Short mmCIF file of N, CA and C in Angstrom, two decimals:
data_model
loop_
_atom_site.label_atom_id
_atom_site.label_comp_id
_atom_site.label_asym_id
_atom_site.label_seq_id
_atom_site.Cartn_x
_atom_site.Cartn_y
_atom_site.Cartn_z
N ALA A 4 88.59 105.15 275.79
CA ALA A 4 87.66 105.55 274.74
C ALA A 4 86.34 106.02 275.33
N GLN A 5 85.25 105.76 274.62
CA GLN A 5 83.92 106.13 275.08
C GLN A 5 83.04 104.93 275.37
N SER A 6 83.12 103.89 274.54
CA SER A 6 82.26 102.73 274.70
C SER A 6 82.46 102.06 276.05
N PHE A 7 83.54 102.40 276.75
CA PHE A 7 83.68 101.99 278.14
C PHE A 7 82.43 102.35 278.93
N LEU A 8 81.97 103.59 278.81
CA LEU A 8 80.73 103.98 279.46
C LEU A 8 79.58 103.10 278.99
N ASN A 9 79.54 102.79 277.70
CA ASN A 9 78.52 101.87 277.21
C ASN A 9 78.59 100.53 277.90
N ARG A 10 79.79 100.07 278.22
CA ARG A 10 79.92 98.85 279.00
C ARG A 10 79.44 99.08 280.42
N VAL A 11 79.55 100.32 280.90
CA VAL A 11 79.20 100.60 282.29
C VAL A 11 77.70 100.49 282.51
N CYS A 12 76.91 101.12 281.64
CA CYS A 12 75.47 101.11 281.83
C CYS A 12 74.90 99.70 281.87
N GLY A 13 75.63 98.72 281.35
CA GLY A 13 75.21 97.34 281.43
C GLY A 13 73.91 97.09 280.70
N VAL A 14 72.84 96.89 281.46
CA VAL A 14 71.54 96.56 280.87
C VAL A 14 70.45 97.56 281.21
N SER A 15 70.65 98.47 282.15
CA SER A 15 69.57 99.30 282.66
C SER A 15 69.98 100.77 282.60
N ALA A 16 69.01 101.63 282.27
CA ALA A 16 69.11 103.08 282.40
C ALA A 16 70.47 103.63 282.01
N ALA A 17 70.76 103.68 280.72
CA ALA A 17 72.05 104.19 280.26
C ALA A 17 72.06 105.71 280.25
N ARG A 18 71.14 106.33 280.98
CA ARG A 18 71.05 107.78 281.04
C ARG A 18 72.12 108.25 282.03
N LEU A 19 73.37 108.13 281.61
CA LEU A 19 74.51 108.39 282.47
C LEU A 19 75.37 109.51 281.89
N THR A 20 75.99 110.27 282.77
CA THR A 20 76.98 111.24 282.37
C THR A 20 78.28 111.01 283.12
N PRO A 21 79.42 111.18 282.46
CA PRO A 21 80.70 111.06 283.16
C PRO A 21 80.67 112.13 284.24
N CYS A 22 81.10 111.72 285.43
CA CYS A 22 81.08 112.58 286.61
C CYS A 22 82.49 113.10 286.79
N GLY A 23 83.18 113.36 285.69
CA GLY A 23 84.54 113.87 285.76
C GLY A 23 85.32 113.62 284.49
N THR A 24 86.56 113.17 284.64
CA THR A 24 87.44 112.94 283.50
C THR A 24 86.99 111.74 282.67
N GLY A 25 87.82 111.34 281.71
CA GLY A 25 87.50 110.21 280.85
C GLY A 25 87.69 108.87 281.53
N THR A 26 88.16 107.88 280.79
CA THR A 26 88.35 106.53 281.30
C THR A 26 89.45 106.51 282.34
N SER A 27 89.22 107.21 283.44
CA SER A 27 90.14 107.21 284.57
C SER A 27 89.39 107.61 285.83
N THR A 28 90.03 107.43 286.99
CA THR A 28 89.36 107.67 288.25
C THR A 28 89.19 109.16 288.52
N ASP A 29 88.56 109.50 289.64
CA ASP A 29 88.42 110.89 290.04
C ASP A 29 88.76 110.96 291.52
N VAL A 30 89.16 112.13 291.98
CA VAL A 30 89.58 112.29 293.37
C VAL A 30 88.48 112.99 294.16
N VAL A 31 88.25 112.51 295.38
CA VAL A 31 87.26 113.08 296.27
C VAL A 31 87.84 113.11 297.68
N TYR A 32 87.28 113.97 298.50
CA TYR A 32 87.73 114.16 299.87
C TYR A 32 86.59 113.72 300.78
N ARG A 33 86.77 112.57 301.43
CA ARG A 33 85.68 111.96 302.17
C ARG A 33 86.19 111.47 303.51
N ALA A 34 85.27 111.29 304.45
CA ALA A 34 85.63 110.75 305.75
C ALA A 34 85.65 109.24 305.69
N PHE A 35 86.48 108.62 306.52
CA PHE A 35 86.53 107.18 306.65
C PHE A 35 86.57 106.81 308.12
N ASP A 36 86.37 105.52 308.37
CA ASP A 36 86.46 104.93 309.70
C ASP A 36 87.35 103.71 309.54
N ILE A 37 88.65 103.90 309.71
CA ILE A 37 89.63 102.92 309.27
C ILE A 37 90.42 102.44 310.47
N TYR A 38 90.97 101.24 310.35
CA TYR A 38 91.79 100.66 311.40
C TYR A 38 92.57 99.49 310.82
N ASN A 39 93.89 99.51 310.98
CA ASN A 39 94.70 98.43 310.44
C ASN A 39 96.04 98.34 311.13
N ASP A 40 97.07 97.96 310.37
CA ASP A 40 98.41 97.76 310.91
C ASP A 40 99.22 99.05 310.94
N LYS A 41 98.56 100.19 310.77
CA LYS A 41 99.24 101.46 310.91
C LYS A 41 98.26 102.53 311.35
N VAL A 42 97.66 103.22 310.39
CA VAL A 42 96.71 104.28 310.71
C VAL A 42 95.52 103.68 311.44
N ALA A 43 94.88 104.49 312.26
CA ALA A 43 93.72 104.04 313.02
C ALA A 43 92.89 105.25 313.41
N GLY A 44 91.58 105.15 313.31
CA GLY A 44 90.73 106.24 313.74
C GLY A 44 89.64 106.51 312.72
N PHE A 45 88.88 107.56 312.99
CA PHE A 45 87.71 107.94 312.22
C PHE A 45 87.89 109.40 311.83
N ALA A 46 88.29 109.65 310.59
CA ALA A 46 88.64 111.00 310.19
C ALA A 46 88.70 111.11 308.68
N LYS A 47 89.03 112.31 308.21
CA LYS A 47 88.92 112.64 306.80
C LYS A 47 90.15 112.15 306.05
N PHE A 48 89.94 111.62 304.86
CA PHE A 48 90.99 111.27 303.93
C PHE A 48 90.58 111.71 302.53
N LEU A 49 91.37 111.28 301.56
CA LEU A 49 91.19 111.67 300.17
C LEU A 49 91.19 110.41 299.32
N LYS A 50 90.00 109.94 298.96
CA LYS A 50 89.89 108.76 298.11
C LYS A 50 90.17 109.16 296.68
N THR A 51 90.70 108.22 295.90
CA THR A 51 91.10 108.58 294.54
C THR A 51 90.85 107.49 293.50
N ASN A 52 91.02 106.22 293.84
CA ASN A 52 90.96 105.14 292.87
C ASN A 52 89.52 104.77 292.53
N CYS A 53 88.72 105.76 292.16
CA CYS A 53 87.32 105.52 291.84
C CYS A 53 86.88 106.42 290.71
N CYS A 54 86.10 105.86 289.79
CA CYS A 54 85.45 106.63 288.74
C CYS A 54 83.98 106.76 289.08
N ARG A 55 83.52 108.00 289.20
CA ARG A 55 82.12 108.30 289.47
C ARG A 55 81.40 108.55 288.15
N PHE A 56 80.12 108.20 288.11
CA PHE A 56 79.27 108.55 286.98
C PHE A 56 77.89 108.85 287.52
N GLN A 57 77.23 109.87 286.99
CA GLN A 57 75.93 110.23 287.52
C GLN A 57 74.82 109.74 286.61
N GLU A 58 73.78 109.19 287.21
CA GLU A 58 72.60 108.84 286.45
C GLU A 58 71.80 110.09 286.17
N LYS A 59 71.25 110.17 284.96
CA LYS A 59 70.46 111.31 284.54
C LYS A 59 69.00 110.91 284.46
N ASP A 60 68.17 111.57 285.26
CA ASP A 60 66.74 111.30 285.25
C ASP A 60 66.16 111.61 283.87
N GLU A 61 64.95 111.13 283.64
CA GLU A 61 64.18 111.49 282.46
C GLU A 61 64.10 113.00 282.35
N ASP A 62 63.90 113.51 281.14
CA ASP A 62 63.94 114.94 280.86
C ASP A 62 65.33 115.47 281.14
N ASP A 63 66.31 114.57 281.14
CA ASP A 63 67.71 114.93 281.33
C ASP A 63 67.93 115.63 282.67
N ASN A 64 67.17 115.23 283.68
CA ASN A 64 67.37 115.77 285.01
C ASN A 64 68.50 115.02 285.71
N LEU A 65 69.22 115.73 286.57
CA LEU A 65 70.31 115.14 287.32
C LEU A 65 69.73 114.52 288.58
N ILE A 66 69.35 113.25 288.48
CA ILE A 66 68.75 112.52 289.58
C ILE A 66 69.79 112.37 290.68
N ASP A 67 69.33 111.90 291.84
CA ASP A 67 70.23 111.64 292.96
C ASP A 67 70.57 110.16 293.03
N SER A 68 71.62 109.80 292.30
CA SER A 68 72.11 108.43 292.29
C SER A 68 73.47 108.45 291.62
N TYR A 69 74.19 107.33 291.68
CA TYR A 69 75.50 107.26 291.08
C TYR A 69 75.85 105.84 290.71
N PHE A 70 76.68 105.70 289.68
CA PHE A 70 77.34 104.45 289.36
C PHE A 70 78.82 104.64 289.63
N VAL A 71 79.33 103.87 290.57
CA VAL A 71 80.70 104.00 291.04
C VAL A 71 81.46 102.78 290.57
N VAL A 72 82.42 102.96 289.68
CA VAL A 72 83.27 101.86 289.28
C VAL A 72 84.60 102.04 289.97
N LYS A 73 85.15 100.95 290.46
CA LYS A 73 86.44 100.97 291.12
C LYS A 73 87.36 99.97 290.45
N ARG A 74 88.62 100.37 290.33
CA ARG A 74 89.68 99.51 289.85
C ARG A 74 90.39 98.93 291.06
N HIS A 75 91.03 97.79 290.89
CA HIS A 75 91.44 97.02 292.04
C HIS A 75 92.77 96.33 291.77
N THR A 76 92.86 95.09 292.25
CA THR A 76 94.02 94.24 292.01
C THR A 76 93.62 93.11 291.08
N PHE A 77 93.47 91.91 291.65
CA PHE A 77 92.97 90.79 290.88
C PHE A 77 92.37 89.75 291.81
N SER A 78 93.20 89.16 292.67
CA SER A 78 92.67 88.27 293.69
C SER A 78 91.52 88.94 294.43
N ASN A 79 91.63 90.25 294.65
CA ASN A 79 90.50 91.03 295.11
C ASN A 79 89.27 90.77 294.26
N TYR A 80 89.43 90.78 292.94
CA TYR A 80 88.29 90.59 292.04
C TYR A 80 87.61 89.26 292.31
N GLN A 81 88.37 88.18 292.33
CA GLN A 81 87.77 86.86 292.48
C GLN A 81 87.17 86.69 293.87
N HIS A 82 87.83 87.24 294.89
CA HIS A 82 87.31 87.14 296.24
C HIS A 82 85.96 87.85 296.35
N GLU A 83 85.93 89.12 295.96
CA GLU A 83 84.69 89.87 295.98
C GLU A 83 83.62 89.17 295.16
N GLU A 84 84.00 88.60 294.02
CA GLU A 84 83.05 87.87 293.19
C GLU A 84 82.44 86.72 293.97
N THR A 85 83.29 85.92 294.59
CA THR A 85 82.82 84.81 295.41
C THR A 85 81.80 85.29 296.41
N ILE A 86 82.15 86.32 297.17
CA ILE A 86 81.24 86.74 298.23
C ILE A 86 79.93 87.25 297.65
N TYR A 87 80.00 88.07 296.60
CA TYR A 87 78.78 88.63 296.04
C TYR A 87 77.85 87.53 295.56
N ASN A 88 78.40 86.55 294.85
CA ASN A 88 77.58 85.42 294.44
C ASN A 88 77.00 84.72 295.65
N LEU A 89 77.74 84.66 296.75
CA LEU A 89 77.23 83.96 297.91
C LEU A 89 76.09 84.73 298.58
N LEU A 90 76.09 86.05 298.46
CA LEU A 90 75.21 86.87 299.27
C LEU A 90 74.18 87.65 298.47
N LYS A 91 74.03 87.35 297.18
CA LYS A 91 73.31 88.26 296.30
C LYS A 91 71.82 88.34 296.61
N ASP A 92 71.36 87.65 297.64
CA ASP A 92 69.93 87.44 297.81
C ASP A 92 69.28 88.37 298.81
N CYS A 93 69.99 88.81 299.84
CA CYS A 93 69.37 89.71 300.80
C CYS A 93 68.97 91.00 300.10
N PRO A 94 67.83 91.58 300.47
CA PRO A 94 67.41 92.83 299.82
C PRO A 94 68.34 93.99 300.06
N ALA A 95 68.93 94.09 301.24
CA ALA A 95 69.69 95.29 301.61
C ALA A 95 71.11 95.24 301.09
N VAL A 96 71.30 94.86 299.83
CA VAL A 96 72.63 94.78 299.25
C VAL A 96 72.59 95.46 297.89
N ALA A 97 73.45 96.46 297.70
CA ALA A 97 73.51 97.14 296.42
C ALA A 97 73.99 96.18 295.34
N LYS A 98 73.21 96.08 294.28
CA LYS A 98 73.49 95.14 293.20
C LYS A 98 74.80 95.52 292.52
N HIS A 99 75.76 94.60 292.54
CA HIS A 99 77.05 94.86 291.94
C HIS A 99 77.13 94.25 290.55
N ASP A 100 78.20 94.59 289.84
CA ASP A 100 78.47 93.96 288.55
C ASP A 100 79.97 93.96 288.34
N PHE A 101 80.54 92.80 288.08
CA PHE A 101 81.98 92.64 287.95
C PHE A 101 82.31 92.33 286.50
N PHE A 102 83.45 92.81 286.03
CA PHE A 102 83.85 92.47 284.67
C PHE A 102 85.33 92.80 284.51
N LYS A 103 85.80 92.72 283.27
CA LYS A 103 87.13 93.19 282.93
C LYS A 103 87.05 94.01 281.65
N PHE A 104 87.76 95.14 281.64
CA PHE A 104 87.80 96.03 280.50
C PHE A 104 89.25 96.31 280.14
N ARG A 105 89.56 96.27 278.85
CA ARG A 105 90.92 96.51 278.41
C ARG A 105 91.12 97.99 278.11
N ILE A 106 92.16 98.57 278.68
CA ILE A 106 92.51 99.95 278.40
C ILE A 106 93.63 99.96 277.38
N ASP A 107 94.85 99.70 277.83
CA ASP A 107 95.97 99.50 276.91
C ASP A 107 96.00 98.03 276.54
N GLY A 108 97.15 97.39 276.68
CA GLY A 108 97.19 95.95 276.62
C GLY A 108 96.89 95.38 278.00
N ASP A 109 95.65 95.52 278.45
CA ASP A 109 95.35 95.24 279.85
C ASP A 109 93.86 95.12 280.14
N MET A 110 93.30 93.92 280.01
CA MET A 110 91.94 93.68 280.47
C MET A 110 91.95 93.73 282.00
N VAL A 111 91.88 94.94 282.52
CA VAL A 111 91.91 95.14 283.97
C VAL A 111 90.54 94.85 284.55
N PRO A 112 90.44 94.17 285.69
CA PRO A 112 89.14 93.95 286.32
C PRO A 112 88.57 95.23 286.88
N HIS A 113 87.28 95.43 286.64
CA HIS A 113 86.55 96.59 287.12
C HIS A 113 85.29 96.14 287.86
N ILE A 114 84.95 96.88 288.91
CA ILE A 114 83.79 96.57 289.72
C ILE A 114 82.86 97.77 289.70
N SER A 115 81.64 97.56 289.25
CA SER A 115 80.66 98.63 289.12
C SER A 115 79.58 98.42 290.16
N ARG A 116 79.50 99.33 291.11
CA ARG A 116 78.42 99.37 292.07
C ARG A 116 77.38 100.37 291.56
N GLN A 117 76.12 99.97 291.59
CA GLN A 117 75.09 100.66 290.83
C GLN A 117 74.09 101.36 291.74
N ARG A 118 73.66 102.55 291.33
CA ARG A 118 72.54 103.25 291.94
C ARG A 118 72.93 103.24 293.41
N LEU A 119 73.85 104.13 293.77
CA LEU A 119 74.25 104.22 295.17
C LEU A 119 73.74 105.60 295.54
N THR A 120 74.44 106.28 296.43
CA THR A 120 74.12 107.63 296.82
C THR A 120 75.42 108.39 297.01
N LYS A 121 75.34 109.72 296.97
CA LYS A 121 76.55 110.51 296.95
C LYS A 121 77.33 110.38 298.26
N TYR A 122 76.63 110.45 299.38
CA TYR A 122 77.28 110.55 300.68
C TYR A 122 76.94 109.36 301.56
N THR A 123 77.96 108.58 301.88
CA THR A 123 77.82 107.46 302.80
C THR A 123 77.34 107.98 304.15
N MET A 124 76.76 107.10 304.96
CA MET A 124 76.40 107.49 306.31
C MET A 124 77.58 108.00 307.09
N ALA A 125 78.78 107.50 306.79
CA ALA A 125 79.98 108.02 307.42
C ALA A 125 80.05 109.52 307.29
N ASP A 126 79.80 110.04 306.09
CA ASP A 126 79.87 111.48 305.89
C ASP A 126 78.90 112.20 306.80
N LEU A 127 77.66 111.73 306.87
CA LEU A 127 76.68 112.37 307.72
C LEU A 127 77.13 112.36 309.17
N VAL A 128 77.51 111.19 309.67
CA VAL A 128 77.87 111.09 311.07
C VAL A 128 79.02 112.02 311.39
N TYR A 129 80.06 111.99 310.56
CA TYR A 129 81.17 112.91 310.79
C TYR A 129 80.68 114.34 310.83
N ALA A 130 80.03 114.78 309.76
CA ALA A 130 79.62 116.17 309.68
C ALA A 130 78.82 116.59 310.89
N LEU A 131 78.08 115.67 311.49
CA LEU A 131 77.40 116.05 312.71
C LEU A 131 78.27 115.95 313.95
N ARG A 132 79.37 115.20 313.90
CA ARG A 132 80.26 115.16 315.05
C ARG A 132 81.21 116.34 315.10
N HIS A 133 81.87 116.64 313.99
CA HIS A 133 82.87 117.69 313.95
C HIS A 133 82.29 118.93 313.32
N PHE A 134 81.08 119.29 313.72
CA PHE A 134 80.42 120.44 313.13
C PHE A 134 81.28 121.67 313.32
N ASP A 135 81.18 122.60 312.37
CA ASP A 135 81.91 123.86 312.44
C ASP A 135 81.03 124.58 311.43
#
């Protein structure tokens, strides 16, 4: 629906615009620095399980910030919740907000990271390494 976005703005600056489709994620092509039980290295991939939303400055200006909500699993939700509650005090931590929103018959957990920036430092570093 639409009131999902109303749930997204939470308590501050609801001057938001959908940064793509409706109540679903959007696809982006970004660099990562990954390492696990298979793939390994620092290179470009295609992230998808994320819904972007842009904050709109006063006078309806397109400010430079974003609200990024991500869908997940579940144990992930409680784990991340635990850690965030444990660490919420250092200044250099983007204020998160966790909740659950029902789409179909499914109060799926959603994680909203607030007032971030478009391009992670990873993007900058890559673009300066593999310049063309």
